[PDB]
């Protein structure tokens, strides 16, 4: 926001004021002739005519713009941090990465490499504005270019700097006949208007179902596109395929399923196997989703899986530690019609 | 800036009445928000509920209004006070020794100034006349303690009002010497100790003595004294 | 940056020129005093000096 | 409302150095007035923080805060600079003053000064029982006395008269004197007194005699 | 340094509407209204002087207006501020005066002078807050989130704003002559004068006593006191002393803005049930309450409407999900369900119906 | 600010818990103050106050 | 190699506030420090500059340096710093000590307090009529030495050095003596002394007669 | 700080040694490169062009022993310094208490951590012989000044060695008078002012005489004062 200085006005009797010129930001002043101002007490001139004010303005920043103000800026790219959990020999742990395909992470021994998104796309246009907690995609005007009313009446290089650029088309005005008033017409400022007329930030309009936030700024959690992950997993952490149990003899039931895209299935494997152990589980088929990484296996026995999918006819294949077996069942479809979670 | 004199110590009797006083300049010119604080020995400190600003209204509030009253005053260039009915319960030492508070709730704030205090007042609610101060070791004897290994000490109980001029002879002997504050017993007189550290040689040579002396009652005490870990007294 | 003047002198920003007291010594003396120098960041101190007028008994 | 919370219940220093004082509120949006006091005199103005700075006593403080936080920083103390310090904002509202924190710089810790004294050798009217004893210097501030009087144990009509710190030796004190009746010492010899310090769970302890 | 206001002191100024609908000069005259904190609090600079006594001090039951030539005391308890309803005023010293206020298109500011009269002083001033969030709520909740806003911080600290001042200028008085015998005198009431004459003398000048002009009417006589030992500030509407903008001095402003947190409510829960590719939501608004809703996909359809009243809305959700923010809570996520009335393994119209539910777009193409 | 410690006990750095000319006294005191104290940003200062003590020798 | 160079030849400022000397040369690498002398006076240390500070006393003063140049400041200058300042880097091939750059406490204003005094009186063997001009009290120091003697303007015939500053006043003084052969004493009724001051740009003036 | 000393002052005669001695306190068993500096008569800071620092070689500027001949020691604590064959123009004060001078361009370089100064000390290259002021102007005049509105006091001259003995009526006096020294003028010899400057209605009511002694020699001089505004005068 601007503000308006006006010096307190010259009053000439008997004879005419002049104008000084000078370099204030939108330096304006004029000359008004036949002015017969009064004070509380009588007027001010000795003469009722031939008489001169001398009325001056300019703008400048407000002492508000330390703290209420708007600022422009230009992006160019991105770059893209990532927080990642792991499950790593069957524990959490969170890698903490640069996602451009740069920064390798090492934690438990492992190292990991992130990136490059495969998609270079991002919510923020070239040209940007920010103001506070939102952000805002705007082709904001020239610095030195912009006009009365609109965003940029006044524009400044840094919050501090004395270099005002303002354009609010100050014009003064003859005063009405006996006062000592400064009258003026100017553009009324136009970061006032922009903060009404504002719209809608980027936190609520982006798409891929982007979040928002401003310091600094970031594009968070972007839907858009997919991630190359690459581990380099140390020889100590795998168990050799004769320290594994060797499951045999393996067959599956589903005693129920319905394709709810939340763990709706259920199958009951029955198995053999030659030691106790822990035991890797994974779904062969990409249209089946199971929940369950790794399991305990024992004995002669059976284990419990839950499953995630689409199909109407879940019928899959699942390996459990180098050892195959197939689930076939009927899905029925879920009643909810919506859910919040993905 | 806000300067400020009070008026010394004083003694009312329970359920009378006391006008404390504070003339003021520092400029000021008139009366400005002069503003206090009340104490007694204990776990905290609190503002006086009849002293903000003083002079719109006396500065009763959601507390205080109760079983004692009180007024804050107008005058020019001092901020006079009456506080009324007092008990035991307002036996205190007084600081009428702020320059302006903000107090926020009000329509109004103030300045921060150079915010310099003030200096203290007291008053001792109490039933007793003058009384003499010459009790258990300070008459007929000597005085020897016989504890302390580089030290010695006194008494003095039962005297009123303060003050009491005592010191190692007449205040002549300094050179060593603490003496701590008078304390209010229920009867209303004063108990009192003071004591020198001189090295244990230097005390086993000279005469030494020390003197209770007390203006209302018009009495002075004096007698020899010779401490156990000392020198002169093996 | 470099101190102040009163134009009198290269006298620096803010101390007293002989006594205390300032505008209760001759109130035109903002006239003279106040004019221009206000404009370099020092004269600040000046304001705190004359008008916190320092008579005897304003004390630290 | 919100109570202005001191964290250090007591900070212990050394004569000629500095240290950090904090205070914690949810709000305050206004001047923050610190202050201190030593014992027998009027308090004073160290600085405002909360708001923005103006300082009372000379130059070596400063004060700063964020969040919840408003804090103060003492320096330069080569003199016997012990006190209690505060801070506080003022009425209106209910809102009221902080607890307090007593500062004090380091001692040579020692045992109590104990001066166990009789009564007068004449005037027997006056209650020769009535011993004295003012102690000092027991270390830190925790204590009480106890007595051995007529060969039992005893602490009834103890006058404890407790005082103020030692004038040039920065360390805490109590007047301690028996009220008890005319012959007593004059028929009973063995009497004590005891500095019953809670830091020591025991007591430091001086006997004595008639003449001696 | 607030000491500042034993050097300069209060004004009579022109005033566009005196109470009455008649422009007046006044002592409560307003010279700038200025808006910039955006929890909508005003600062209002007015040519009164607050917190002060005509004795220069510190008074904060007081003001000092201006009786005619030199400042006189009246009470703060009295000075009032409003704009439709009474404002709460939340600050004041010297010139400047802090306000928290209802809405309106005009502003007045006044007070009771020492003769029990009262002023006031009226502009046109378009006062609307901006809303902080999503809801247009008029008064904070007991209950809410917190949101970033600016104040002008209620500590006078007089720091960083600061404005001008000048020597005033001459002050015309019409009683400072009179008509007796056929010459005009001129009356000096123990202030230094300055007066100029038509008449058939240069007699013209300055003096400190009072004078006898000769032969001249009144009205060919003018004078005005000259000398003004207080400053003042160097308004517009009252008239500089000379073209060079002399005999200055500044004074530091209080109040400075503070970033500061808000709270604003947040709107209760709406009620929601579940349609085939559908959530509909039953609204309860308080206050003017904004909804939005996205897709969460590559084209986001962004939507949004103020709502005023219950009502109740049906949000078609896509494949790619729905996001609906409503007032200042978080925002609700919704995703659709492959649920159908149909069935798969039933007989072929059955099997048909199940996908074309599922897969409206792909079964009528592959069919 | 910061301070350091020793032992039972925390204390200023500037002078030592122990009797001036401490090192000259008790050249061992390291063996005591400096197993894990090390870390302390008043250590610089503890370290000077001990070594370079301003003995009774010197003045001020 | 340099010599060191300081930027303010003259300097004069009330109580209180700020200075700001400097000094220069077209090199550093090796530490330059600043030294105070009071009149009369041994030399103290304040600063040290090149990279990092050293000092004897606590930090009213204290100074930095960027490039070429090295400067010191001292805070609430209304002490006796009444002084010439000056720095030195010691090594090789010559480098040498700054020129002494001087600041003074702005004395309120008066004219020369100048003197005259009686000689030898009765005797005229040789000498006797040796009376003696003083410079006193005033500042600053554009003067020079007149004299009103014999009836006229003289100069010459006259034993002349320069003495200490007036202690509990401001400025320098000298002992111009009137030389004059023998019964000088008394040929002449007056004897004037004279100040020439490029500042006052005229003369203030004292005298005496015998008795008087 | 390390504590610093000198030898007394000294005065002199062309064509002999000097053997100045310094001593540095505190640490500084071996010197810490403490160095000979030395300043002529109210000259700007011209230096020693005789020794830098020294505890080891007798190291000098490069320009004295072309003129005069120059050296130092570097015995433990104690930096002695000779100076021979001199001349007048070698009258100056001697600063040995000085910190380390770090020689750059040539051997090796030294501390910042720690401050080091002191006192300056006198050697006197004369030709004058032992000399009070007192048979001069004191003895057979009276002491007389004429100002009138405030110059009023008293004169010495010509005294050699230093110091003066200056005193006036009952002690008391010296508390209202000031007193401005000599210094060693091209003759060999010293001149003194001391005056009583107040304006005349708080100064004409006393009675004023004066008492100067040359402790050297015991040449002394008590003298009656006759200033103008007294009546003592007239």
Same mark, same amino acid.
């Given at each position: ?342 | ?234 | ?60 | ?104 710089? #380091?001692?040579? $810790?020692? &045992?109590?000064? !104990?001066?166990?004294?009789?009564? %007068?050798?004449?005037?027997? +009217? @006056? ?59 004059? #028929?009973?010899? $063995?009497? &004590?007194?005891? !500095?019953?310090?809670?830091?020591? %769970?025991?007591?430091?302890? +001086? @006997? ?5 | ?367």
């Amino acid at each position: 926001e601007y503000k308006t200085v006006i010096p307190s006005p010259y009053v000439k009797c008997c004879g005419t004021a002049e104008c000084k010129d000078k370099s204030l930001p939108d330096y304006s002043c004029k000359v008004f002739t036949g002015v017969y101002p009064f004070m509380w007490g009588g007027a001010y001139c000795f003469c009722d005519t031939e008489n001169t004010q001398l009325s001056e303005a300019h703008v400048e920043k407000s002492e508000s713009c330390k703290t209420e103000f708007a600022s422009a800026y230009r992006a160019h790219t991105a770059s893209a941090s990532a927080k990642l959990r792991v499950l790593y020999q069957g524990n959490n742990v969170t890698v903490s990465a640069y996602a451009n395909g740069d920064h390798a992470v090492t934690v438990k021994d492992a190292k990991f490499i992130v990136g490059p998104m495969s998609s270079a796309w991002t919510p923020f246009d070239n040209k940007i504005v920010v103001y506070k907690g939102d952000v805002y995609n705007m082709d904001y005007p020239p610095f030195g270019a912009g006009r009365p009313g609109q965003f940029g009446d006044i524009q400044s290089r840094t919050p501090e700097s004395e270099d005002v650029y303002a354009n609010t088309q100050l014009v003064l005005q003859r005063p009405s006949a006996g006062t000592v008033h400064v009258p003026y017409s100017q553009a009324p400022s136009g970061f006032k208007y922009w903060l009404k007329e504002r719209g809608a930030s980027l936190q609520h309009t982006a798409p891929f179902g982007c979040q928002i936030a401003t310091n600094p700024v970031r594009a968070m959690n972007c839907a858009v596109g997919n991630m190359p992950i690459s581990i380099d997993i140390p020889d100590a952490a795998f168990t050799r395929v004769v320290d594994a149990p060797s499951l045999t003899d393996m067959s599956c039931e589903v005693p129920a399923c319905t394709h709810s895209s939340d763990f709706g299935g259920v199958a009951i494997i029955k198995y053999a196997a030659s030691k106790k152990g822990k035991c890797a589980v994974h779904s062969m088929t990409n249209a089946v989703t199971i929940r369950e990484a790794e399991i305990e296996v024992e004995g002669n026995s059976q284990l419990q899986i839950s499953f995630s999918t689409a199909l109407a006819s879940a019928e899959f294949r699942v390996q459990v530690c180098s050892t195959q077996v197939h689930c076939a069942a009927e899905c029925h479809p879920p009643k909810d019609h919506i859910v919040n979670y993905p | 800036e806000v300067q400020l004199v009070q008026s010394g110590a004083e003694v009312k009797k329970p359920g009378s009445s006391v006008k404390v006083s504070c003339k003021a300049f520092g400029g000021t010119f008139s009366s400005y928000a002069i503003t206090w604080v009340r104490q007694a020995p204990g776990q905290g400190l609190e503002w006086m509920g009849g002293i903000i600003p003083i002079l719109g209204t006396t500065d009763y509030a959601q507390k205080f209004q109760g079983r004692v009253t009180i007024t804050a005053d107008k005058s020019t260039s001092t901020a006079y006070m009456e506080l009324s009915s007092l008990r035991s319960e307002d036996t205190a030492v007084y600081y009428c020794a702020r320059d302006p508070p903000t107090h926020g709730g009000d329509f109004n704030y103030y300045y921060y100034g150079v915010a310099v205090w003030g200096q203290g007042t007291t008053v001792t609610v109490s039933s007793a006349s003058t009384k003499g101060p010459s009790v258990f070791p300070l008459a007929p004897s000597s005085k020897s303690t016989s504890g302390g290994t580089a030290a010695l000490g006194c008494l003095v109980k039962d005297y009123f009002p303060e003050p009491v001029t005592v010191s190692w002879n007449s205040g002549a002997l300094t050179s060593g010497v603490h003496t701590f504050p008078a304390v209010l017993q229920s009867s209303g007189l004063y108990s009192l100790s003071s004591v020198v550290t001189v090295p244990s040689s230097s005390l086993g040579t000279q005469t030494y003595i020390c003197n209770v002396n007390h203006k209302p009652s018009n009495t002075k005490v004096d007698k020899k004294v010779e401490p156990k870990s000392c020198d002169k007294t093996h | 940056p470099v101190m102040c003047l009163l134009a009198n002198t290269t006298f620096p920003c803010s101390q007293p020129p002989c006594t205390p007291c300032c505008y209760e010594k001759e109130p035109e003396e903002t006239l003279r005093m106040l004019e221009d120098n206000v404009m370099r960041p020092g004269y600040y101190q000046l304001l705190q000096a004359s008008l916190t007028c320092s008579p005897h008994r304003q004390r630290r | 409302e919100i109570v202005l919370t001191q964290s250090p219940g007591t900070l212990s220093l050394s004569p000629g150095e500095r240290a950090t004082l904090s205070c914690r509120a949810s709000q305050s949006n206004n001047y923050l007035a610190w202050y201190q006091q030593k014992p027998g005199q009027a308090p004073r103005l160290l600085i405002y923080g909360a708001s923005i700075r103006a300082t009372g006593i000379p130059d070596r403080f400063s004060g700063s805060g964020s969040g919840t936080d408003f804090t103060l920083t003492i320096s330069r103390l080569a003199p016997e600079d012990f006190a209690v310090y505060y801070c506080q904002q003022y009425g209106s509202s209910p809102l009221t003053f902080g607890p307090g924190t007593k500062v004090d710089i #380091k001692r040579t $810790v020692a &045992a109590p000064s !104990v001066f166990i004294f009789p009564p %007068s050798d004449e005037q027997l +009217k @006056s209650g020769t029982a009535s011993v004295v004893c003012l102690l000092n210097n027991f270390y830190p501030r925790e204590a009480k006395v106890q007595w051995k009087v007529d060969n039992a144990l005893q602490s009834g009509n103890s006058q404890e008269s407790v005082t103020e710190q030692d004038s040039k030796d920065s360390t805490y004190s109590l007047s301690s004197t028996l009220t008890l009746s005319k012959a007593d010492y004059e #028929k009973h010899k $063995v009497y &004590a007194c005891e !500095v019953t310090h809670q830091g020591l %769970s025991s007591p430091v302890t +001086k @006997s004595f005699n008639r003449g001696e | 340094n607030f000491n500042v206001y034993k050097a300069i002191r209060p004004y009579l100024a022109h005033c566009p509407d005196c109470g009455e609908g008649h422009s007046c000069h006044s002592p409560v005259a307003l010279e700038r209204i200025r808006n910039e904190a955006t929890d909508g609090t005003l600062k209002i600079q007015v040519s009164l002087q607050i917190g002060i006594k005509t004795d220069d001090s510190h008074d904060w039951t007081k003001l000092r207006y201006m009786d005619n030539h030199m400042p006189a005391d009246a009470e703060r308890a009295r000075l009032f501020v409003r704009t439709s309803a009474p404002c709460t005023i939340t600050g004041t010293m010297g010139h400047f005066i802090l306000a928290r206020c209802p809405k309106g298109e005009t502003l007045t500011v006044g007070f009771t002078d020492g003769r029990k009269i009262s002023h006031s002083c009226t502009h046109p001033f378009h006062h609307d807050p901006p809303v902080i969030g999503r809801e247009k709520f008029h008064s904070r909740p007991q209950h809410g989130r917190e949101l970033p806003c600016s104040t002008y911080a209620q500590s006078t600290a007089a720091t960083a704003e600061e404005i001008e001042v000048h020597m005033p200028p001459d002050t015309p008085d019409r009683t400072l002559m009179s008509q007796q015998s056929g010459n005009v005198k001129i009356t000096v009431n123990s202030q230094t004068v300055r007066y100029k004459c038509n008449c058939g003398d240069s007699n013209e000048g300055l003096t400190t006593t009072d004078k006898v002009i000769n032969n001249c009417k009144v009205d060919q006589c003018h004078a005005a006191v000259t000398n003004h030992k207080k400053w003042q500030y160097n308004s517009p509407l009252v008239p500089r002393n000379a073209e060079l903008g002399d005999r200055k001095g500044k004074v530091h402003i209080p109040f400075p803005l503070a970033n500061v947190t808000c709270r604003v409510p947040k709107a209760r829960n709406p009620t929601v049930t579940y349609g085939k590719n559908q959530v509909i939501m039953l609204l309860y608004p308080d206050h003017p309450t904004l909804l939005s809703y996205r897709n969460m996909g590559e084209e986001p359809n962004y939507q949004e409407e103020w709502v005023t009243h219950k009502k109740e809305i049906r949000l078609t959700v896509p494949t790619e999900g729905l996001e609906v923010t409503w007032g200042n809570n978080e925002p609700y996520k919704y995703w659709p369900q492959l649920s159908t009335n149909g069935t798969a393994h039933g007989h072929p119209h059955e099997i048909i119906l199940y996908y074309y539910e599922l897969y409206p777009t792909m079964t009528v193409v592959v069919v």
